[PDB]
Design a protein around this nucleic acid. Structure first.
Ligand SMILES: [Cl-]
Lengths: 76, 77
DNA sequence: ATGTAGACTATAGTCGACA
DNA sequence: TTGTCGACTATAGTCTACA
């Protein structure tokens, strides 16, 4: 059960909630499917870098900021 | 082509060269195929988080450090 | 609003062969 | 040593509907 993947999905959900988005909102902005967004947040599905990039765009967060948050989660 | 993917593969190759590894060495350690390692570095192939995780392990670099380097590349040029 | 189900497509990732 | 091509298997990512 992948450590990094679980940190990545955690950061995605955390950012999503801060911005008050629904999964559907993020799906729309990400150009991804709602169910796949759920799969990622809930079941730690293994997304690609491209899909992560689209999600970062959809969440309206810079990659830099995203990875900064990600580093912070890993450090705990 | 994808901006982020190109930064990721760049960091991977850069680390690989610093450690004096061949693609084959990294394939072995990563538990990935040599040709896929080539695909990533050369053709910006779209790896998953799991495969990136395995590569980070194969390169013997912490995720933290990897993403620190990655942030630095993004901040340029 | 979210998660699961299932069936279906595109492509991740393997493998042998050779330049 | 690396990159490629092509063929194969595994799974990311889609879509519909429903509790
Ligand atoms: Cl070069």
């Amino acid at each position: 059960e992948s450590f990094l993947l679980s940190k990545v999905s955690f950061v995605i959900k955390k950012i999503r909630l801060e911005k008050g988005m629904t999964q559907e909102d993020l799906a729309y902005k990400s150009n991804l499917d709602r169910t796949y967004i759920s799969g990622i947040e809930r079941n730690s599905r293994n997304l690609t870098i491209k899909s992560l990039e689209l999600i970062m765009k959809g969440l309206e967060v810079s990659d830099v900021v995203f990875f900064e948050m990600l580093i912070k989660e890993i450090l705990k």
